[PDB]
Scaffold this active site. Structure first.
Site, PDB file in Angstrom:
ATOM      1  N   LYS A 188      44.603  38.795  43.036  1.00 32.98           N
ATOM      2  CA  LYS A 188      43.929  37.711  42.273  1.00 32.98           C
ATOM      3  C   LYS A 188      43.025  38.339  41.200  1.00 32.98           C
ATOM      4  O   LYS A 188      43.043  37.881  40.042  1.00 32.98           O
ATOM      5  CB  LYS A 188      43.089  36.845  43.214  1.00 32.98           C
ATOM      6  CG  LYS A 188      42.473  35.606  42.588  1.00 32.98           C
ATOM      7  CD  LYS A 188      41.148  35.116  43.190  1.00 32.98           C
ATOM      8  CE  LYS A 188      41.003  35.246  44.693  1.00 32.98           C
ATOM      9  NZ  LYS A 188      39.567  35.308  45.071  1.00 32.98           N
ATOM     10  N   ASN A 189      42.209  39.310  41.593  1.00 35.75           N
ATOM     11  CA  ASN A 189      41.242  39.979  40.677  1.00 35.75           C
ATOM     12  C   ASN A 189      41.993  40.777  39.597  1.00 35.75           C
ATOM     13  O   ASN A 189      41.606  40.724  38.387  1.00 35.75           O
ATOM     14  CB  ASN A 189      40.279  40.847  41.485  1.00 35.75           C
ATOM     15  CG  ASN A 189      39.404  40.029  42.409  1.00 35.75           C
ATOM     16  OD1 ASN A 189      39.205  38.844  42.187  1.00 35.75           O
ATOM     17  ND2 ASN A 189      38.912  40.670  43.461  1.00 35.75           N
TER      18      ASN A 189
HETATM   19  C1  LIG Z   1      31.731  38.506  44.737  1.00 34.68           C
HETATM   20  S1  LIG Z   1      33.347  37.881  44.761  1.00 34.68           S
HETATM   21  O1  LIG Z   1      34.107  38.666  45.706  1.00 34.68           O
HETATM   22  O2  LIG Z   1      33.346  36.461  44.969  1.00 34.68           O
HETATM   23  N1  LIG Z   1      33.992  38.162  43.301  1.00 34.68           N
HETATM   24  C2  LIG Z   1      33.485  37.419  42.145  1.00 34.68           C
HETATM   25  C3  LIG Z   1      34.613  37.265  41.161  1.00 34.68           C
HETATM   26  C4  LIG Z   1      35.549  38.450  41.046  1.00 34.68           C
HETATM   27  O3  LIG Z   1      35.163  38.983  39.775  1.00 34.68           O
HETATM   28  C5  LIG Z   1      35.969  39.827  39.073  1.00 34.68           C
HETATM   29  C6  LIG Z   1      37.335  39.971  38.986  1.00 34.68           C
HETATM   30  C7  LIG Z   1      37.877  40.946  38.166  1.00 34.68           C
HETATM   31  C8  LIG Z   1      37.044  41.790  37.435  1.00 34.68           C
HETATM   32  C9  LIG Z   1      37.558  42.862  36.559  1.00 34.68           C
HETATM   33  C10 LIG Z   1      37.330  43.107  35.211  1.00 34.68           C
HETATM   34  C11 LIG Z   1      36.524  42.164  34.381  1.00 34.68           C
HETATM   35  O4  LIG Z   1      36.537  40.940  34.608  1.00 34.68           O
HETATM   36  N2  LIG Z   1      35.710  42.689  33.463  1.00 34.68           N
HETATM   37  C12 LIG Z   1      34.778  41.884  32.698  1.00 34.68           C
HETATM   38  C13 LIG Z   1      33.323  42.023  33.153  1.00 34.68           C
HETATM   39  C14 LIG Z   1      32.419  41.147  32.296  1.00 34.68           C
HETATM   40  C15 LIG Z   1      31.205  40.638  33.073  1.00 34.68           C
HETATM   41  C16 LIG Z   1      30.669  41.698  34.027  1.00 34.68           C
HETATM   42  C17 LIG Z   1      29.280  41.370  34.575  1.00 34.68           C
HETATM   43  O5  LIG Z   1      28.326  41.542  33.852  1.00 34.68           O
HETATM   44  O6  LIG Z   1      29.178  40.991  35.702  1.00 34.68           O
HETATM   45  C18 LIG Z   1      31.701  41.998  35.100  1.00 34.68           C
HETATM   46  C19 LIG Z   1      33.121  41.682  34.621  1.00 34.68           C
HETATM   47  N3  LIG Z   1      37.960  44.228  34.893  1.00 34.68           N
HETATM   48  O7  LIG Z   1      38.523  44.787  36.129  1.00 34.68           O
HETATM   49  C20 LIG Z   1      38.244  43.890  37.107  1.00 34.68           C
HETATM   50  C21 LIG Z   1      38.757  44.081  38.457  1.00 34.68           C
HETATM   51  C22 LIG Z   1      37.950  43.805  39.548  1.00 34.68           C
HETATM   52  C23 LIG Z   1      38.449  43.902  40.805  1.00 34.68           C
HETATM   53 CL1  LIG Z   1      37.414  43.578  42.167  1.00 34.68          CL
HETATM   54  C24 LIG Z   1      39.756  44.298  41.036  1.00 34.68           C
HETATM   55  O8  LIG Z   1      40.204  44.304  42.316  1.00 34.68           O
HETATM   56  C25 LIG Z   1      40.602  44.503  39.949  1.00 34.68           C
HETATM   57  C26 LIG Z   1      40.106  44.375  38.661  1.00 34.68           C
HETATM   58  O9  LIG Z   1      40.882  44.621  37.579  1.00 34.68           O
HETATM   59  C27 LIG Z   1      35.665  41.642  37.573  1.00 34.68           C
HETATM   60  C28 LIG Z   1      35.140  40.664  38.376  1.00 34.68           C
HETATM   61  C29 LIG Z   1      35.503  39.537  42.107  1.00 34.68           C
HETATM   62  C30 LIG Z   1      34.249  39.542  42.950  1.00 34.68           C
END
Ligand SMILES: CS(=O)(=O)N1CCC(Oc2ccc(-c3c(C(=O)NC[C@H]4CC[C@@H](C(=O)O)CC4)noc3-c3cc(Cl)c(O)cc3O)cc2)CC1
Ligand SMILES: CS(=O)(=O)N1CCC(Oc2ccc(-c3c(C(=O)NC[C@H]4CC[C@@H](C(=O)O)CC4)noc3-c3cc(Cl)c(O)cc3O)cc2)CC1
Lengths: 354, 371
Positions: free
Chosen positions: B251-252
Site C-alpha cells: 500500500k505504502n
Molecule cells: C503511521 S501509519 O503507519 O499510519 N502510516 C501513515 C501513512 C503512511 O505514510 C507514508 C507512505 C509512503 C511514504 C513514502 C514516501 C512519501 O510519501 N514521501 C513524501 C513525504 C512528504 C511528507 C513527509 C513528512 O513530512 O511527513 C513524509 C512523506 N516516499 O517513500 C515512502 C514509503 C514509505 C513506506 Cl513506509 C514504504 O513502505 C514505502 C515507501 O515508498 C511516506 C509515508 C505510512 C505510515
C-alpha cells in the site's frame, strides 16, 4: 602540574557544535586568525576536559593498561599546552603564530591515538581475559572517545591548514579540510580504486564498479556538496574493502564476479550513497558484531566509519540479506547549514553508563 | 466457599487482574505450536494451558491500560476496550474449576474463545480511536507522547499474541467438517510458499490502488534459495501475519510510486526479493517512489502519525513491525530521498528460533508510565 584543576573547570562547560557553514565562515574573509584563536583557546580545553573526565570513569583494569595511561598523558599535556595561551594577547601576531605551532605539536603528539587506545583494550583483554567486544562499558566509551577525537582533529586541522601560510597548499581550493564543491562520485571512484589495488594484490580479482547518480531537482547535474572529502573517503574505502572481500569469498570462481553498484542520490535534505554487493550477506543477529570494537581490519574501521557519518548529523547503516548480499548506506546532510557537529558531552546521562 | 477465583463478578475484576498479573506470560515456539496440533488428545492440554495463560496475558496488559494518563484512559474507546478485556477475563475464569475430562467443558471452552475473538475483533481501530479522542480533545500530538507510543507497542503486541493463542485452539479443535486451508496446523502453514503470500498481498493492494488511482505499479518477484537454488522458498509461518505486513508495505510503496508519478499510466514496478539463508528468511520490497529523508523515517513508525485513498489509520506500519518482532523477526525501512524506498521483513528461517516475544508487566514497565 595543575591539570586536575583545569580538567575540573573546563569539564563544567558543554562543547559548542559548529555547522559546516560556520567552519567555512571561520576560514573565510568574514573571520580572521584572531577569531579562530579566541574560539579555540576556550573550545579545545572544554572538549579535552569533557572526554578526560570520561577516560577517568573507565574500569581501573582498563585505565591502568600502559597504552591507556600513555593516551591519558598526551591529553593532559595537550590541555596544559593550551593553558599557556589563556592570558595572552590576541592582538599580538606572536601569540597567533605560537598558537598555530602549539596545535601542530598537539596534532603530531595525538597522531596515533586511535591504534594506541585500541592497543590498551587489547592489553586489557590479553591480561584479564574479558572479551572487549562483549564489554558494554568499553564499547560505549570508545564510540564517544573516537567521536570526541574526530571533533578535536577537525578543529585543529581547520586552524593549522588555514593559518599555516602553507607554502604550496595540497588541494588549494579547499577551506582547510572542507571541499565546498566536493564531487561525490570522484571520492567514490578514488576509494574504489584504492580498495581495487589492494583486492587485486591479495585475490587477483576484484568486482567492477557501477555508479548511478539521481539528482532529484536537476537530472543532468553531476552531484556536488560541501563536505570533508577525507572523511567521505575513509567511509567509502572501508565499505568497498568489506563488499569486495565478501564478493570474492562467496564466489567459487574469480572469473565473473558480480559488480559493486553505487547509487548517489541528492534530495532536498539528504545526500544518500548506497553501496550494493552480492557477497552472500550476514544474518541479522550478527550485524551488531560488525560495529563492535575489536570483534574477531584492526578492529575499528567500520565503527569509526559510522562515527565520521554521525559527526555531521549523518549515519552509516547496513541492511543485509543472508544468502544474497549487503547494502551499506551513507546518509549525509545535503545543506552546509544542516551539517552540525555531533559531540559527546560529559553529563549525568554519560556518568550513568559507567 | 468464597475463594478469590470462584463465582467471579464484575465487582471482583480488580482482584482477579491483580492475581493473574503476578504471573509472567509463557512464550511458545512455532515448533511447540506445531506439536500441539499433532493429536486431538492435545485438546485437554490446550484447555488446561489456556484457562491459565489467557487470564495471565489479559491481566498483564490490563495492569498497563490502567497506568495510561487519566485523559487517555477515560476516553470512551479506551473504556470500551477495557470493558471487553474484563468480560473476556470473567468468561475464562468460569472454566477454572471445570473438569477437562468432560467433553462438554472442552466444547463450551471453544465456544467461549470464539465469543471472545468476535468481541475483540475491532480492538485495533477502537484503541486507535481512543488515542484520537484524546488528541482531538486536548491538542497533545500523540506522535510525540512517549507514554502512548510505549503503551501502544506493548498493547498491540499483546493483542497479536492473544489472537494467536485463540486462533490455534479454535482452528485446531473446533472440528470444521471441511476446513478452508486443510494442510495448516491452526493458523500455521508448515509449508508456507512465501512468494504466493507476496502475490496475494500485492493483488489486494492493487485492487485498492486501482479504486483511487488511474494506474498501479506491476509486481516483480525474485527468489534466492542460497542452499538449494532450484527449490521454491517455503518456511513454517503464520501466512495471515505475513500477509498483513506485506499488504501494508505494498500500500505504502504503491502510494509513494503513484504520488511521485502523478499522471503516468506506466509506473516503475515494485520489486520483491525473497532470500533464504541458514538463519534468516529476508523479504525486500523496493520502489522508485521518491523516498523519505532520514530525519522523517522515525515518524512513519509512530502511532497516529499522518503526512483517505491508501492513507494510513495511524497504526498500519508500526503494527506490521510488531508482527515481524512477534516471532523474533524485524521490519526495517531504508530510503534514499529523491529515488525510492526499500522495506525489509526479516523472519527466522527455523521454527525452533521463532519464539513468541511478549510484553510482561513488571517494575521496569510500571516506571515508563511515571511522571
Ligand atoms: C503511521 S501509519 O503507519 O499510519 N502510516 C501513515 C501513512 C503512511 O505514510 C507514508 C507512505 C509512503 C511514504 C513514502 C514516501 C512519501 O510519501 N514521501 C513524501 C513525504 C512528504 C511528507 C513527509 C513528512 O513530512 O511527513 C513524509 C512523506 N516516499 O517513500 C515512502 C514509503 C514509505 C513506506 Cl513506509 C514504504 O513502505 C514505502 C515507501 O515508498 C511516506 C509515508 C505510512 C505510515
Ligand atoms: C569491527 S571491524 O570494522 O574491524 N570489522 C568489520 C568488518 C569485518 O569484516 C567483514 C567483511 C564483510 C562481511 C560480509 C559478509 C561475510 O563475510 N559473511 C560471512 C560471515 C561474516 C562474519 C560472521 C560472524 O561473525 O560470525 C557471519 C557471516 N557478507 O557481507 C559482508 C559485508 C559486510 C560489510 Cl560491513 C559491508 O560493508 C559489506 C559486506 O558485503 C562481514 C565481515 C571485519 C572487521
Amino acid at each position: 602540574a595543575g591539570a586536575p584543576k583545569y580538567i575540573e573547570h573546563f569539564s563544567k562547560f558543554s562543547p559548542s557544535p559548529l555547522s559546516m557553514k560556520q567552519f567555512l565562515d571561520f576560514g573565510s574573509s568574514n573571520a580572521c586568525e584572531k577569531t579562530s584563536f579566541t574560539f579555540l583557546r576556550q573550545e579545545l580545553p572544554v572538549r579535552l576536559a569533557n572526554i578526560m573526565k570520561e577516560i577517568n570513569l573507565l574500569p581501573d583494569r582498563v585505565l591502568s593498561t600502559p597504552s591507556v595511561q600513555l593516551v591519558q598523558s598526551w591529553y593532559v599535556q595537550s590541555l596544559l599546552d593550551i593553558m599557556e595561551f589563556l592570558d595572552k594577547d590576541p592582538e599580538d601576531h606572536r601569540t597567533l603564530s605560537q598558537f598555530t605551532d602549539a596545535l601542530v605539536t598537539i596534532r603530531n603528539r595525538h597522531n596515533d591515538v586511535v591504534p594506541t587506545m585500541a592497543q590498551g583494550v587489547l592489553e586489557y583483554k590479553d591480561t584479564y581475559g574479558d572479551d572487549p567486544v562483549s564489554n558494554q562499558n568499553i564499547q560505549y566509551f570508545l564510540d564517544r572517545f573516537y567521536l570526541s577525537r574526530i571533533s578535536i582533529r577537525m578543529l585543529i586541522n581547520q586552524h593549522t591548514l588555514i593559518f599555516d601560510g602553507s607554502t604550496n597548499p595540497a588541494h588549494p581550493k579547499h577551506i582547510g579540510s572542507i571541499d565546498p564543491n566536493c564531487n561525490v562520485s570522484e571520492v567514490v571512484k578514488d576509494a574504489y580504486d584504492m580498495a581495487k589495488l589492494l583486492c587485486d594484490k591479495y585475490y587477483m580479482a576484484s568486482p567492477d564498479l557501477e555508479i548511478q547518480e539521481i539528482n532529484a531537482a536537476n537530472s543532468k547535474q553531476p552531484i556536488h556538496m560541501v563536505y570533508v572529502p577525507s572523511h567521505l573517503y575513509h567511509m567509502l574505502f572501508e565499505l568497498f574493502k568489506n563488499a569486495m572481500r565478501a564478493t570474492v569469498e562467496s564466489h567459487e570462481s574469480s572469473l565473473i564476479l558480480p559488480p559493486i553498484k553505487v547509487m548517489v542520490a541528492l534530495g532536498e535534505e539528504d545526500l544518500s550513497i548506497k553501496m550494493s554487493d552480492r557477497g552472500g550477506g550476514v544474518p541479522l543477529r550478527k550485524i551488531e558484531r560488525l560495529f563492535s570494537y575489536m570483534y574477531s581490519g584492526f578492529g575499528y574501521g567500520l565503527p569509526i566509519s559510522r562515527l565520521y557519518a554521525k559527526y555531521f548529523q549523518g549515519d552509516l547503516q547496513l541492511f543485509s540479506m543472508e544468502g544474497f548480499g549487503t547494502d551499506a548506506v551513507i546518509y549525509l546532510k545535503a545543506l552546509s547549514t544542516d551539517s552540525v557537529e555531533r559531540l559527546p558531552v560529559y553529563n549525568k546521562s554519560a556518568w550513568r553508563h559507567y
